[PDB]
Amino acid sequence: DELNLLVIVVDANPIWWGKQALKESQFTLSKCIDAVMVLGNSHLFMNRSNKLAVIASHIQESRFLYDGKYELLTSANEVIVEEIKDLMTKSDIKGQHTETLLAGSLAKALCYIHRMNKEVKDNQEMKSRILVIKAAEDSALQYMNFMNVIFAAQKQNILIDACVLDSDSGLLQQACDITGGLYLKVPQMPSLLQYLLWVFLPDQDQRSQLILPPPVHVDYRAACFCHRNLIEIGYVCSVCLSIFCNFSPICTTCETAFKIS
Amino acid sequence: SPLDIYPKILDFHPVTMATFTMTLARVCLCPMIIGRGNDQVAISSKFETREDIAVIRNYGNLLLEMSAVVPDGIVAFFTSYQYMESTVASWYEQGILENIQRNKLLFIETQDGAETSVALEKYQEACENGRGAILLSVARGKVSEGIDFVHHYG
Amino acid sequence: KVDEYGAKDYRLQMPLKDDHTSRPLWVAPDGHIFLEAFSPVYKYAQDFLVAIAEPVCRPTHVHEYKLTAYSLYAAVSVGLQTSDITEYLRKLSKTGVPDGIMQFIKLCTVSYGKVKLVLKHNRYFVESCHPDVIQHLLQDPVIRECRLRNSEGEATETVSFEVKQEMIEELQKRCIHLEYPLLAEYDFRNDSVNPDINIDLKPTAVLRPYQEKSLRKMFGNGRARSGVIVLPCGAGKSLVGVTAACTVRKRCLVLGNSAVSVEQWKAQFKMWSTIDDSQICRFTSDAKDKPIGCSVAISTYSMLGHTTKRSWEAERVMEWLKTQEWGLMILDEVHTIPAKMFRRVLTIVQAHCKLGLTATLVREDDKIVDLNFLIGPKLYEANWMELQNNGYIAKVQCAEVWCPMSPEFYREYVAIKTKKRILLYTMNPNKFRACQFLIKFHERRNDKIIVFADNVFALKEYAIRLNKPYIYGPTSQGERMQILQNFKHNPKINTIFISKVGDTSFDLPEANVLIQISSHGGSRRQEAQRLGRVLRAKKGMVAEEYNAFFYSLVSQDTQEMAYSTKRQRFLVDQGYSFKVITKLAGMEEEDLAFSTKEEQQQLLQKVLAAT
Amino acid sequence: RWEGGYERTWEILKEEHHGQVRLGMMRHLYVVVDGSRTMEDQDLKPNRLTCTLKLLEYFVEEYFDQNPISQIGIIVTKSKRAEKLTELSGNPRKHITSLKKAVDMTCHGEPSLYNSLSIAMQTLKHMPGHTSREVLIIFSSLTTCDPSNIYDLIKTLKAAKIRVSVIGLSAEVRVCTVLARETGGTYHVILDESHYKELLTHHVSPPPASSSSECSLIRMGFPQHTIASLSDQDAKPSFSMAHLDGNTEPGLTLGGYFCPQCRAKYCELPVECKICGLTLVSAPHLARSYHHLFPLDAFQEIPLEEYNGERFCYGCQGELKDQHVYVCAVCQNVFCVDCDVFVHDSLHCCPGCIH
Ligand SMILES: [Zn+2]
Ligand SMILES: [Zn+2]
Ligand SMILES: [Zn+2]
Ligand SMILES: [Zn+2]
């Protein structure tokens, strides 16, 4: 009855992969796609009850991606390749939006997980986890919405695993710390698949007996809106929760004067 | 209820005899008839059966359950003073009245006007003070004549 | 035809129709009927089968009923014709009804109520609307002898004829052989010889649905009809009889098993009827009352079965009873009637409507077929499990507890071969320990403990060692009621040991824990009736399915086991289950008697001393 | 006379977001539960006590989920007296443990509104003005014993600006209605366990802020998870203050959370500092309640036939076959019933709006 779902979100920002391609490094987007497909095939291999969900995170939208080889594996790989080529071939940069819709892809993944769980019969319990690979830079404006995702997963007790390739994201670190998922940056991009298999492939119960690298240290500093500097102790607004370094009689954000006689 | 007895009682012919039915979006009244007790005793108030012990005990059980269930405002109208007093005495002897007192405070009217006034005042004070108050009166008594019950009293 | 597996191949004679799940009944051509309780039409089929068929087995899901000539007679006298019965059967039968069963029903119903027996002017007449039947029946020699003879020995001449009083039951049996059963119908409203009585129903009287249903089935078209109604003890069966008597309102005679039964009947009549106590008398040897003006006379079979000379006043009262003709007669504990002395009582008394009430109807001597015409057809039998569901009676928790035999005791038991083996296994030290543990556990639970022991010696030893009240043969009635009230009122003493007299010799206060140690030895109805009478409906645990606890101690590897399975079979017919409890949890920690075998061998000494 | 004749032959026949208003940013909630005789009644299976305590644990979980910086106090009123079962604090595990322990309580006596309210007021008498003072009471029995006048206590509570909410079980009580109305709270009646859960969920959300409520610039510190490693020579363990006041061995960890104001060490968050009174929180805790500041408006339910657009859900690509399809207000996307319910209930953000 153990139904393991491993939703994989792929950072499919064309700009970062173009930068990497111009660098002519050993690792490209094709290798990333191949590693993701192999990991998903292995996940489906480990048990019949296991399910695979692959969604590509792109700036324009979040795409639901899904001869001597397994029939279902071959069909799934064909579908994934078809969808990714259809998206990237028609991926026309129209606008200055560079940050990928990371939050939207996570929200769509959570909706898909909820729909699967509703479709899952009471006879079986569907353990769910999400693995996200980070390649491009992190986004700022999504932060709040990103937070809305995190607790939501913690609402349904879903692990969130982060695989940073190039650009670190403290948001991902905090999400992994909160939801209990694993955060780790790949030192050598060509070795990505083994990092996926050795660490992110086993389930948490399997991870329980397994010995794994300790989680990275996570900080929780704050930005003082008037200057957005690091702050240890700050003045918290009781109206709109805006934080200030110095005492103020009127809050800039809530526009409500602090009635301190 | 009868629109023709009054022209006969008052010996006249009224011009208009019209009854205005009540239309309620929300039901505020729940009239119920209980002719059978817990022991399936045929509940009656005929003076031949008014002295029956079974009827008195079933009335006591009904009042006890209502006090344990229904909110503070409880009023009970009997048929005569002597019958009500005998029923109260029987309830005290049986001990059913003691449980009713344990659940809600009880107030019984007498023939004294001042005593009945004090009883009404205490009943209203208890009802407005959150403690269950039960009043016992007669259909021909002063309570049924000129006393009005609010939502939290009736 | 029989299959190689032994089952009867009735498939050929049963044309199955496609309305399988819709229709709940199977009608085998043997006369048996099967019903499924889970069917949505269960209630309708239940009532139909009860009206037409005599129930046999009623377990949880599937029930078996049987068709008998007496059952068909009861159905006809209720007022149902052949066509309606056939139509309803075919509407409920899963398969087609075999033509043999159809023909059997036709033959039975075509002649039911044909012959009429009338008790008028203290004389019994046989009449009918078919004089050819009567004339042809005159050829029967038994009918010739039963027919009243003139003063010169000649035979007395819809014209009826008088029949000898002594030869009623002979005619009863003979008519069955004549395939023309008599009709026990009374002029309920057309009565003029016996006026009514100032007796009515108190408003406190409540008719539960099954009670009212049985009464109305008895009152076929408003006329009372003789029969037998089976209700569990304490289900208002006495109240049902009182209600029937009030309905009849004619002269009423009631017979009970013992004096306690007479007292209870009088109390019930006072408790629910409006008859003045001046008209209620007890024809007993202790409380003597004038029979004159006694609207309802209550007595016992022995008081009427005394072949020996009675007291002079008793003779006068018997003369008064014989002279008076009774509109209603009531007999309790019908299962004791088939005895010859009690059967003679029916001949002795001249009454119109005789109604019998009891808890069981399976006499171990199979003398029940005659009872079908001693009184009449079985009118009603409430479903015990159904009454349990409605909460009218307690939902009993039955259990059989097996007790290992001590090696010395078992060797002695095997050594003896005669009837004397009873003492050894009834005095099993392990059985004693089990009973003691049960008593301790239920007293700690504050339960009403009643322990039965048919053997006199075993009862004495058990009760004395456990230091509890014991009642047996002597049973001084004053001290008997003293002990009963001590059990009822004193919470310190709630463990009563009762001998065989606990069946019907006195009144059992309602209890919750009944432990049976020794039984008659196959009286499947006697101890089942004892269980039914002991355990009554109790408030507080009605929601739970186990609010009454019954334990039956049986010694392992003894013949007693063979009795228990033989006996509780009757209770199996009512769906009751008995879970085997080989070992009792908790006996180890609590100290009990006979912990040492050295005590047990002294007990063996004591037992063998009495052979 | 029903015995005249009767046959069953004929029986045998073939056949709620409010406006963009200020809310309870900081809440000090006290839960008072009756322990009277009537708690053993079977209004809710199995009895009032068991269902009440289970739903209370669920309420505590949800309330701490949606109110990170709040507090919960548990008081049990029985035998005309009140027992301070649990102190006002923010630990969910301790309160759940206390409720599980109290599952086996003794339901006896009658509730005492006066004593419980007086204890709650005394506890909340010194609370800061900016923090809201809200009390929730579960009333089983209809009778309360008052060792003094109750309306004077009502006046004192109103002067103390302490909100009182009542959720009864039997029927409406005039005194409870007056108490709820005068102090600004709400009075509710339980219809069943589902309605009980609905009322508890409605009470989970922060109440609308009163006009008289103050708006002060409160000062809070945000320490990090300073973990000391034995590879460092400055790995000096110290028993946590929260664990120190414990029967068992307090957690002697090398590192953890150190107060930025008085260097107090705590192994659990969010916990207000015992020594200097500093409210030690974390950044996610503040952002955890932002959905209250920005509620998601209900989507437009349109029949599928009248919806002349796409036939797949935007959130799950589900082939929409239901008679009702929910369209977003902002980006006007296509969502099925399941996604429409879940996003508003849990996600609180429309992905298309983010896009
Ligand atoms: Zn502000
Ligand atoms: Zn501090
Ligand atoms: Zn959807
Ligand atoms: Zn939207």
Side-chain angles (χ1 to χ4, degrees), chain C residues 47 88 215-216 219 221-222, chain D residues 2-4 6 8-9 11-12:
Chain C
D47 300 341
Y88 273 171
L215 289 175
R216 279 173 302 180
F219 288 124
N221 296 334
Chain D
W2 343 261
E3 314 298 322
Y6 137 84
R8 297 183 178 182
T9 57
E11 298 185 4
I12 328 296

Side-chain angles (χ1 to χ4, degrees), chain D residues 19-301:
Chain D
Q20 216 75 201
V21 300
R22 309 175 182 180
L23 300 181
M25 301 292 97
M26 288 174 293
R27 308 168 71 182
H28 296 346
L29 176 55
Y30 251 96
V31 178
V32 179
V33 182
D34 189 7
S36 64
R37 50 166 189 171
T38 57
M39 270 299 180
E40 304 295 74
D41 194 356
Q42 295 183 356
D43 299 358
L44 296 182
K45 304 306 178 181
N47 53 18
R48 304 181 185 177
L49 170 64
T50 303
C51 176
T52 296
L53 291 205
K54 172 185 178 182
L55 294 189
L56 225 183
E57 299 183 20
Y58 144 78
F59 173 87
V60 165
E61 295 176 355
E62 188 81 325
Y63 176 82
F64 277 138
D65 175 73
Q66 287 194 352
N67 308 269
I69 335 177
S70 60
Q71 292 170 335
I72 293 184
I74 302 180
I75 295 182
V76 180
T77 162
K78 74 175 183 181
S79 178
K80 306 161 294 180
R81 287 168 297 184
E83 302 179 5
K84 194 178 185 182
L85 178 58
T86 311
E87 291 290 334
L88 190 68
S89 58
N91 189 315
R93 304 178 180 181
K94 174 185 178 181
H95 299 0
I96 294 178
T97 302
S98 60
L99 287 179
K100 291 182 177 181
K101 171 186 177 182
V103 167
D104 300 330
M105 71 172 63
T106 303
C107 298
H108 177 63
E110 290 191 6
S112 176
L113 300 180
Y114 179 85
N115 299 118
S116 307
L117 287 179
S118 300
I119 293 182
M121 181 190 62
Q122 177 269 354
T123 306
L124 301 180
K125 196 172 186 177
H126 312 269
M127 290 305 174
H130 42 261
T131 58
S132 63
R133 281 158 288 274
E134 159 71 296
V135 178
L136 177 56
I137 298 180
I138 305 175
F139 208 42
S140 175
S141 179
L142 301 188
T143 61
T144 173
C145 297
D146 311 331
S148 181
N149 187 17
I150 177 176
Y151 298 94
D152 302 330
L153 189 53
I154 300 180
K155 304 172 185 179
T156 318
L157 290 179
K158 185 53 186 177
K161 309 174 183 178
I162 298 182
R163 187 185 189 91
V164 175
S165 298
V166 180
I167 298 178
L169 288 82
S170 308
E172 187 179 359
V173 182
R174 184 61 181 182
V175 164
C176 299
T177 302
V178 174
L179 178 58
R181 183 177 184 179
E182 179 176 347
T183 12
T186 60
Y187 180 78
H188 295 276
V189 183
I190 290 170
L191 293 177
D192 70 323
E193 189 171 5
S194 303
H195 195 191
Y196 203 169
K197 177 187 176 184
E198 293 181 12
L199 295 173
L200 291 188
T201 301
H202 167 47
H203 289 50
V204 164
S205 175
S210 64
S211 58
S212 58
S213 183
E214 293 186 355
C215 303
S216 67
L217 184 57
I218 183 177
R219 186 184 182 184
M220 301 180 179
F222 301 93
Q224 296 183 179
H225 190 13
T226 301
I227 307 176
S229 183
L230 287 181
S231 61
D232 313 332
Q233 297 188 8
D234 297 332
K236 354 94 172 179
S238 295
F239 297 91
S240 179
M241 301 297 102
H243 292 65
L244 219 172
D245 201 337
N247 305 16
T248 335
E249 295 79 17
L252 51 151
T253 63
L254 314 166
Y257 310 98
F258 274 92
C259 173
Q261 185 169 357
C262 65
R263 289 309 177 186
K265 180 173 183 177
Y266 298 90
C267 288
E268 300 181 3
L269 284 184
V271 175
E272 168 265 2
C273 190
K274 303 296 182 179
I275 296 177
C276 64
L278 189 57
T279 304
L280 303 179
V281 226
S282 188
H285 304 163
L286 311 181
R288 191 170 305 179
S289 56
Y290 285 176
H291 66 285
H292 303 287
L293 305 183
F294 306 88
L296 216 290
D297 304 333
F299 285 166
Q300 290 76 17
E301 178 180 343

Side-chain angles (χ1 to χ4, degrees), chain A residues 237-242 244 251-256 258:
Chain A
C237 179
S238 56
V239 182
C240 59
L241 304 183
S242 50
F244 302 95
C251 190
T252 66
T253 301
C254 72
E255 278 201 10
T256 301
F258 297 95

Side-chain angles (χ1 to χ4, degrees), chain C residues 197 245 250-256 262 265-266 269 275 278-284 289-300 304 317 320-321 324 326 328-331 349:
Chain C
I197 302 167
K250 303 301 183 179
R251 212 63 172 186
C252 176
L253 165 65
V254 178
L255 300 185
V262 164
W265 271 99
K266 182 179 185 179
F269 264 86
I275 174 177
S278 58
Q279 301 171 346
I280 293 180
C281 302
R282 297 164 291 177
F283 178 50
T284 62
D289 295 322
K290 287 78 183 180
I292 305 178
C294 171
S295 298
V296 180
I298 315 180
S299 174
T300 62
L304 294 182
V317 181
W320 185 89
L321 262 69
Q324 182 77 11
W326 302 85
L328 173 65
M329 178 172 58
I330 301 181
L331 314 175
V349 184

